[PDB]
């Protein structure tokens, strides 16, 4: 039952520098199934135990590929499933991605 101060101190040490998309679920194995190359992402300062990316991210999905999930790297620190899978070639737009302790 951490207080807001503990959550803010904790989140200040997360430094996810890049993101990668996966067609297979990367939670079991985040090293394989790379769909797109690493793309830099930027994160804001913690507030009320939450952080979010400061700006939009654009990713080039290769030909005849599909995207299902994502994984953060800096080593890997997090993974998650996209709001909806999409069979495109094109540009996939990722809005703010938030990490929370609430």
């Amino acid at each position: 039952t951490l207080t807001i101060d503990g959550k803010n101190k904790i989140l200040a040490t997360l430094t996810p520098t890049t993101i990668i998309l996966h067609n297979v679920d990367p939670t079991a194995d985040p090293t394989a199934n790379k769909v797109t190359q690493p793309v830099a992402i930027y994160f804001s300062e913690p507030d009320n135990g939450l952080i979010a990316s400061e700006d939009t991210v654009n990713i080039t999905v290769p030909a005849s590929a599909t995207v299902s999930h994502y994984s953060l790297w800096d080593k890997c620190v997090a993974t998650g499933a996209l709001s909806k899978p999409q069979f495109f070639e094109g540009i996939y737009v990722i809005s703010s991605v938030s990490v929370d302790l609430n």
Partner: protein
């Protein structure tokens, strides 16, 4: 209305004088207390009205006006904000209020999972006759992990969210260094020094590169203990070490233990800002109320070894004389003295103004492309350089221009004059002394 023949007012406060120099500071804070992205202030009192005592903007504004003579004016820039709204408990009333530019505010309500609650708000805003074109909304998450995102949209530049304890509201900066700086420049370009509240490694390095492409100076502090160890720049990886690696000459970094919640940089800015550019050495500066740099572990002044570690990183520090703290070197991360950078920027602005008086204002008429016109260009350039010599910034100079009978006839059709060059000799200054002597009968 009726006025007394003589009106007199007296107060028991204390006041000091101001002075004018080259460049006014700007503070890039994360706040939403006002709509416009930049606002000016002429005293700590005015800052206190829109900011309380614990705000970062208040701390920085207080440090700046602790010197004498006082800076004439400070600007406070604003950073774009985004809000995330989520339900922290069970679902069984919920209401929020959203504000936008121009004072447009529209409360919303949905009296009853969490997802099914937020979707009601999203539809309401998108269906509102106004505000929908000015803001963007988004919902994601299932059942109990539902969340909402609200951000600036369209031409609208300002957005706020508030509230119903069943609704949890969070805020976070949305814009990076590049996007934030571009937005502010399009509104007000009257500022020279820039400092920022955010001190993350990612943000500071991004801002440093952006300023390197413009003509400004970016003052920042640092308190990372790893900067005090090692003496090879190649091996180091702290923030000051990375800055020196990239040879950024327009970024000034100051090491200070208290640089975590306080902003000692703004004190350093006020040391030289009041005076004219190029005629002041920034080393050996005395700052009022700023304590010497101390080791976090034991609160002792930094040792000689640790100072040498900062020297190879081109990072400033508050050394100690015999009881007097002083910022010693005052060199940018690129190894160039500050007064050199400031003087070059003032000179490069004076030259531009003088030339634009001829090209645009057309004093004495347009310029012909014969020897008559070129001699006029020589006169304006020489005058500006002589102004530098009067300040003691330089000591001599020379100017060279192409002969009108030798310029290729392709430029004569493009109305462009090239091959105009000059050189200057710096005056210099003294900061250290070495002495030896002997005693004998």
């Amino acid at each position: 209305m009726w006025n007394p023949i003589v009106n007199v007012d007296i107060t028991l406060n204390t006041a000091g004088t101001t002075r004018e120099g080259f460049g006014l500071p700007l503070f890039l804070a994360s706040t939403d207390n006002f709509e416009e992205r930049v606002r000016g202030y002429t005293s700590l009192t005015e800052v206190a009205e829109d900011f309380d005592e614990n705000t970062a903007a208040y701390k920085a504004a207080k440090q700046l006006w602790s010197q004498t003579p006082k800076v004439t004016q400070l600007y406070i820039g604003r950073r774009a904000m985004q809000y995330t709204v989520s339900i922290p408990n069970a679902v069984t009333d919920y209401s929020i209020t959203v504000a936008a530019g121009g004072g447009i505010s529209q409360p919303y309500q949905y009296t009853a999972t969490a997802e099914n609650v937020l979707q009601q708000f999203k539809t309401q805003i998108e269906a509102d006759p106004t505000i929908k074109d000015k803001v963007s909304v988004n919902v994601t998450g299932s059942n109990g992990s539902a969340t909402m995102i609200i951000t600036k949209a369209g031409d609208n530049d300002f957005v706020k969210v508030t509230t119903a304890q069943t609704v949890y509201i969070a805020s976070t900066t949305a814009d990076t260094a590049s996007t934030a700086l571009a937005a502010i420049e399009a509104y007000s370009t009257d500022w020279y020094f820039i400092a920022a509240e955010d001190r993350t490694q990612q943000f500071v390095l991004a801002m440093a590169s952006e300023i390197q492409a413009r003509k400004k100076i970016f003052f920042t502090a640092n308190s990372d203990v790893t900067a005090l160890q090692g003496t090879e720049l190649a091996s180091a990886n702290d923030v000051p070490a990375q800055l020196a690696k990239n040879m950024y000459t327009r970024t000034v970094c100051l090491w200070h233990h208290a640089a975590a919640e306080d902003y000692p940089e703004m004190a350093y800015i006020a040391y030289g800002a009041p005076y004219d550019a190029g005629s002041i050495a920034w080393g050996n500066a005395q700052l009022t109320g700023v304590a010497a740099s101390l080791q976090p572990s034991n609160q002792r002044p930094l040792t000689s070894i640790q100072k040498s570690a900062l020297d190879v990183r081109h990072c400033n520090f508050i050394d100690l004389d015999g009881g007097v703290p002083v910022v010693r070197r005052g060199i940018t991360s690129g190894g160039e003295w500050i007064d050199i950078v400031r003087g070059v920027d003032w000179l490069e602005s004076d030259l531009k103004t003088s030339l634009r008086d001829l090209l645009i204002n057309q004093k004495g008429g347009k310029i012909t492309y014969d020897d008559t016109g070129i001699t006029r260009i020589r006169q304006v350039i020489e005058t500006s350089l002589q102004r530098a010599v009067n300040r003691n910034f330089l000591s001599s100079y020379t100017v060279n221009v192409p002969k009108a009978s030798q310029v290729a006839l392709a430029d004569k059709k493009a109305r462009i004059l090239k091959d105009v060059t000059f050189a200057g000799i710096l005056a210099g200054a003294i900061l250290d002394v070495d002495l030896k002597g002997t005693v004998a009968y």
